[PDB]
Amino acid sequence: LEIIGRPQPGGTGFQPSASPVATQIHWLDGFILVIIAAITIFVTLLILYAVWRFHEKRNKVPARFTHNSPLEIAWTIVPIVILVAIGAFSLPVLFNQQEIPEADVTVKVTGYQWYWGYEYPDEEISFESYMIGSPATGGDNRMSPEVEQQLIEAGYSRDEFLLATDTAMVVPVNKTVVVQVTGADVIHSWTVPAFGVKQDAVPGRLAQLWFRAEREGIFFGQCSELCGISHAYMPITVKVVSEEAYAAWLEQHHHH
Amino acid sequence: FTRWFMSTNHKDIGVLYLFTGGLVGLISVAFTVYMRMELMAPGVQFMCAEHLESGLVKGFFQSLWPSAVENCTPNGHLWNVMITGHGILMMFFVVIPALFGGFGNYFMPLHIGAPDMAFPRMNNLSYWLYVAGTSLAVASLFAPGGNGQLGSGIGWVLYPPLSTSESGYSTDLAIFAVHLSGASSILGAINMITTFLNMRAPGMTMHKVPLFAWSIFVTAWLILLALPVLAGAITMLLTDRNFGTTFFQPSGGGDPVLYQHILWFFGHPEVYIIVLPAFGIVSHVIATFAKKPIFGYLPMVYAMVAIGVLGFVVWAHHMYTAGLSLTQQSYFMMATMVIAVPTGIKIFSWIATMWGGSIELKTPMLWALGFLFLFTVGGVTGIVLSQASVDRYYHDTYYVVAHFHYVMSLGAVFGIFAGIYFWIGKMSGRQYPEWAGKLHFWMMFVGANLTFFPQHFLGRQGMPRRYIDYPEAFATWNFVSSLGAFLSFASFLFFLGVIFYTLTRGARVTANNYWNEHADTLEWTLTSPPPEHTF
Ligand code: HEA
Ligand code: HEA
Ligand SMILES: CCCCCCCCCCO[C@@H]1O[C@H](CO)[C@@H](O[C@H]2O[C@H](CO)[C@@H](O)[C@H](O)[C@H]2O)[C@H](O)[C@H]1O
Ligand SMILES: CCCCCCCCCCO[C@@H]1O[C@H](CO)[C@@H](O[C@H]2O[C@H](CO)[C@@H](O)[C@H](O)[C@H]2O)[C@H](O)[C@H]1O
Ligand SMILES: CCCCCCCCCCO[C@@H]1O[C@H](CO)[C@@H](O[C@H]2O[C@H](CO)[C@@H](O)[C@H](O)[C@H]2O)[C@H](O)[C@H]1O
Ligand SMILES: CCCCCCCCCCO[C@@H]1O[C@H](CO)[C@@H](O[C@H]2O[C@H](CO)[C@@H](O)[C@H](O)[C@H]2O)[C@H](O)[C@H]1O
Ligand SMILES: CCCCCCCCCCCCC
Ligand SMILES: CCCCCCCCCCCCC
Ligand SMILES: CCCCCCCCCCCCC
Ligand SMILES: [Ca+2]
Ligand SMILES: [Cu+]
Numbered sequence: 054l055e056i057i058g059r060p061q062p063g064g065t066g067f068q069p070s071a072s073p074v075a076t077q078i079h080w081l082d083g084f085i086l087v088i089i090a091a092i093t094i095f096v097t098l099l100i101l102y103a104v105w106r107f108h109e110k111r112n113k114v115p116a117r118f119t120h121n122s123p124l125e126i127a128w129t130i131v132p133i134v135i136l137v138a139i140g141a142f143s144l145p146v147l148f149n150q151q152e153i154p155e156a157d158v159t160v161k162v163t164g165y166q167w168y169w170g171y172e173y174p175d176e177e178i179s180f181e182s183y184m185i186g187s188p189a190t191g192g193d194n195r196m197s198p199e200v201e202q203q204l205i206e207a208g209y210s211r212d213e214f215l216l217a218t219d220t221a222m223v224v225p226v227n228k229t230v231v232v233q234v235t236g237a238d239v240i241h242s243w244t245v246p247a248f249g250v251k252q253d254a255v256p257g258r259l260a261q262l263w264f265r266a267e268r269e270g271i272f273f274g275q276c277s278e279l280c281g282i283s284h285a286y287m288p289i290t291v292k293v294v295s296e297e298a299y300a301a302w303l304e305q306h307h308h309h
Numbered sequence: 310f311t312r313w314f315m316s317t318n319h320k321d322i323g324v325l326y327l328f329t330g331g332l333v334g335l336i337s338v339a340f341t342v343y344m345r346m347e348l349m350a351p352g353v354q355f356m357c358a359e360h361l362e363s364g365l366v367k368g369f370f371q372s373l374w375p376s377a378v379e380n381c382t383p384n385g386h387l388w389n390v391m392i393t394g395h396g397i398l399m400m401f402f403v404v405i406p407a408l409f410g411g412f413g414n415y416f417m418p419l420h421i422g423a424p425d426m427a428f429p430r431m432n433n434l435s436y437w438l439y440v441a442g443t444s445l446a447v448a449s450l451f452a453p454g455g456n457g458q459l460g461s462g463i464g465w466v467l468y469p470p471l472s473t474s475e476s477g478y479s480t481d482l483a484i485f486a487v488h489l490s491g492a493s494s495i496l497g498a499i500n501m502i503t504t505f506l507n508m509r510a511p512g513m514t515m516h517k518v519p520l521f522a523w524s525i526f527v528t529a530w531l532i533l534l535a536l537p538v539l540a541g542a543i544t545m546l547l548t549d550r551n552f553g554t555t556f557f558q559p560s561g562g563g564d565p566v567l568y569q570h571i572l573w574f575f576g577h578p579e580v581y582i583i584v585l586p587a588f589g590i591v592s593h594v595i596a597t598f599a600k601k602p603i604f605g606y607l608p609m610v611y612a613m614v615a616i617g618v619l620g621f622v623v624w625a626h627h628m629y630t631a632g633l634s635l636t637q638q639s640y641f642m643m644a645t646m647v648i649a650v651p652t653g654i655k656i657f658s659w660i661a662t663m664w665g666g667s668i669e670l671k672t673p674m675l676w677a678l679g680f681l682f683l684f685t686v687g688g689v690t691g692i693v694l695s696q697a698s699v700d701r702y703y704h705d706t707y708y709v710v711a712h713f714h715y716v717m718s719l720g721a722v723f724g725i726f727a728g729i730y731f732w733i734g735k736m737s738g739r740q741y742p743e744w745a746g747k748l749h750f751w752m753m754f755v756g757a758n759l760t761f762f763p764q765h766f767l768g769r770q771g772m773p774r775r776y777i778d779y780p781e782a783f784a785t786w787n788f789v790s791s792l793g794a795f796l797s798f799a800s801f802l803f804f805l806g807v808i809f810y811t812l813t814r815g816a817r818v819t820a821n822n823y824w825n826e827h828a829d830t831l832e833w834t835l836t837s838p839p840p841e842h843t844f
């Protein structure tokens with residue numbers, strides 16, 4: 054499997070998209086980015102122009118005006134218009150994100166200090182997922198030869214340290230996955246940037262998110278609500294595979 | 310000489326707040342330097358569990374020198390303690406005390422022609438509550454805390470159940486520190502409001518009050534509503550921890566998310582409490598050095614009032630991933646976008662004020678112009694964040710960290726520096742050296758941008774907040790960010806040099822108004838420093 058959902062060295066953009074929701078986020082952000090870069094360049098060029106043109110050596114007697122109605126009209130309406138245009142594109146995306154469709158695959162995720170528990174209620178599969186290099190795998194949350202060895206054996210490399218876990222959440226490509234998220238002890242947050250999803254894992258609440266992965270590969274997230282000493286050390290690995298490979302994975306967990 | 314601390318004069322209390330805020334600021338900035346040392350490179354090199362075996366002093370000193378990864382057992386608890394300490398000091402014990410307690414107490418009575426505050430003994434008490442709060446916050450760092458170590462690793466906003474299950478009593482001390490801060494702020498606010506309403510000089514009508522005085526007045530009102538709400542939230546944490554309540558514990562039918570609603574109901578106003586006095590200072594400075602009256606005086610007042618008011622109905626934009634319904638998310642998104650309008654507008658007014666002026670680029674003016682740029686860069690990423698669908702990706706990442714350091718942290722700081730250079734001659738009788746002012750400005754301006762701009766990239770790449778260590782791929786922009794922080798630190802140490810120089814051997818101020826006629830508010834009609842008893 055190709056490692057797709059990961060930060061890349063010196064990156065400045067989003068992680069690659071692997072869901073239609075992530076694609077919508079990338080587009081919406083790209084659209085807002087153009088506007089805000091324009092606003093920022095505009096404001097900056099205005100300040101710099103005003104300082105050059107009206108420097109005390111160039112403009113010796115200051116004006117005294119404190120009003121300009123056309124300008125005050127324009128500079129009020131234009132911001133209002135800009136935000137309405139953004140909201141018009143933005144709300145449908147929000148609606149697409151938060152309206153949970155019918156699940157092909159259902160996973161229940163529980164955050165613990167400091168690891169994730171996964172349950173597939175339709176399959177009676179359950180397991181825990183620890184950072185490779187956490188005390189669970191014999192480490193103490195740092196790189197070491199032993200840790201690099203474990204990364205390699207699990208199908209990763211040194212570069213995936215802090216991202217890769219001992220077990221992955223495995224799902225089939227092009228299927229609707231609904232994830233039910235809760236916390237066991239404190240608040241955690243479950244996220245996969247490549248899917249455009251994030252949901253706090255709050256004790257006493259079960260909250261839902263969805264994604265449909267549009268290509269096979271490996272995708273990482275990291276716990277996104279401070280939850281104590283090993284917050285930095287309880288990541289998320291999702292493996293998106295063929296329908297057949299997913300079935301094979303399921304059968305491997307079936308007890309006869 | 311320690312008859313400084315018993316004084317009830319608004320000018321003396323203002324100076325005490327400025328120096329104290331400055332000293333606490335130095336401590337909190339030093340925490341950020343250590344933070345950026347550890348974040349400079351992937352792998353943990355400084356915050357090693359091995360340093361705990363040593364003494365308190367010896368452990369401290371070993372922790373400033375990098376170890377090989379193989380000799381450094383990562384200690385995430387110290388990271389969390391430091392960032393919690395950094396945040397709490399800044400939000401409760403640095404910038405508001407400097408702006409509201411410092412410049413607010415010194416200048417608001419001067420600006421409205423009031424001899425002193427309505428209740429001077431209460432003002433003195435507000436200062437001592439600030440000092441007691443600071444003392445407890447700092448003490449908490451050395452008190453038995455989470456994970457059998459010292460200090461609370463819980464975030465400046467103290468989310469339960471983490472905050473309620475943190476061991477030891479470090480967290481209870483932190484909560485008491487915040488109570489004392491709130492009490493200081495509330496006394497200050499009572500004084501500011503009473504004075505502003507009852508003690509204006511004859512002829513000083515509501516429409517003749519300077520913008521800074523207005524900014525302090527609006528701020529004071531936000532404090533009266535926001536701070537008691539925070540007092541409730543944290544008392545509820547205190548009772549969950551010590552007195553058997555389960556407000557935020559599911560086993561007893563509580564809801565951790567309830568805490569968030571109450572905390573952020575204070576929490577949003579808090580950021581406007583921070584920035585409003587900076588808005589005031591920016592208006593005075595730009596009007597002075599553009600030699601031109603402020604563009605739209607009444608719109609400026611109304612915008613501030615409107616922002617202040619709307620700042621109470623947007624809180625849940627801090628909670629988009631916490632489990633809010635689609636309806637809630639949509640409402641808070643719209644409400645947040647609305648408040649963006651009067652806020653963003655004020656930038657146009659400040660530029661219009663410069664426009665057609667006769668501009669001198671002295672130090673205070675440089676800070677004000679820096680403010681306009683940084684506040685804009687920060688404000689526009691706020692616009693991005695308001696969109697809940699996009700916040701899904703950015704929430705609890707370094708993109709949010711970049712946002713609020715630009716808009717809030719640097720906004721307040723550039724406001725503070727603008728005030729200090731503007732007013733130091735007035736307050737002390739001594740003038741700062743102009744070349745050093747400007748050098749400070751440029752070092753800080755370049756440093757701050759190097760620190761925070763790369764953090765937008767870290768956030769886009771998915772780097773979470775509150776992490777001691779990070780995947781190798783985040784290395785480049787973390788390294789650049791850290792070099793920026795070290796340069797900003799150098800600039801701040803230079804600043805402290807500049808202030809020491811100014812106060813001990815700076816050129817004697819001889820004029821009442823050492824700027825120009827367009828600095829036209831009352832403090833510029835008094836001597837430098839003003840008489841003991843003014844008006
Ligand atoms: C100075 C204080 C300050 C100010 C003014 C702002 C301004 C804004 N903030 Fe920021 N904010 C903080 C301080 C501040 N913020 C802090 C401290 C946090 C997080 C704390 C923590 O978690 O620890 C935060 C976090 C935060 C979040 C939650 C992010 C998250 O945790 O996931 C959101 C979401 O809506 C948000 C939105 C906005 C918006 C839309 C604005 C807008 O009001 C900005 C207005 C826009 C501009 C100033 C741009 C310039 C505009 C023009 C020149 C013309 C106008 C044009 C248009 C409106 C198109 N902010
Ligand atoms: C006003 C608020 C303020 C200010 C000024 C700063 C200043 C700085 N902050 Fe801070 N920051 C916060 C508020 C602020 N911060 C908060 C609330 C958090 C969240 C904590 C949490 O996660 O819970 C945070 C978190 C935070 C993080 C993320 C931590 C994490 O997620 O793990 C980082 C990372 O580098 C950081 C860095 C810096 C740096 C390098 C500086 C500075 O070094 C930048 C350079 C600036 C200077 C050198 C100027 C200093 C001047 C003053 C402070 C004025 C003093 C007063 C007088 C002179 C009268 N801060
Ligand atoms: C959205 C971005 C905006 C950023 C802000 C920068 C723009 C500011 C431009 C101000 O424009 C000036 O406004 C004056 C007042 O309206 C006009 O004076 C006119 O009106 C005055 C009376 O008010 C007279 O004194 C003058 O002679 C007469 O030219 C003047 O022509 C015009 O150039
Ligand atoms: C006036 C401003 C004052 C601000 C203070 C600034 C202090 C600067 C500290 C720089 O020290 C560096 O720290 C790195 C650790 O981040 C070390 O990285 C190296 O050594 C580590 C082991 O210690 C390895 O893990 C790293 O990969 C390797 O790059 C590097 O040798 C060392 O030079
Ligand atoms: C811990 C952080 C360390 C921060 C780094 C500090 C770097 C300081 C550089 C010192 O160089 C200074 O440069 C000034 C500017 O050239 C000189 O002023 C001189 O030049 C000015 C020219 O604008 C004149 O106004 C002054 O009167 C005249 O003294 C000044 O003598 C000289 O010492
Ligand atoms: C961590 C600590 C970092 C260091 C911080 C120190 C910052 C403050 C240094 C101020 O430097 C002074 O500036 C004066 C103002 O420019 C100079 O006066 C010079 O210029 C005047 C104005 O032309 C003349 O009248 C004077 O005689 C002539 O000495 C003076 O030499 C120079 O020392
Ligand atoms: C491939 C995407 C690169 C885009 C990086 C620019 C992000 C910077 C955001 C902050 C802009 C504030 C004006
Ligand atoms: C091989 C060791 C490299 C030496 C670098 C030491 C870093 C010194 C940091 C001290 C700064 C204190 C604020
Ligand atoms: C007095 C001449 C100084 C040299 C010009 C400096 C330009 C000032 C621009 C500052 C604006 C920062 C955004
Ligand atoms: Ca490190
Ligand atoms: Cu966690």
Ligand SMILES: [Cu+]
Pocket residue numbers: 241242276277278279280281283284285
């Ligand atoms: Cu976490």
Ligand SMILES: [Cu+]
Pocket residue numbers: 576577580623624626627
């Ligand atoms: Cu807010």
Ligand SMILES: [Mg+2]
Pocket residue numbers: 242277278704705
């Ligand atoms: Mg969060």
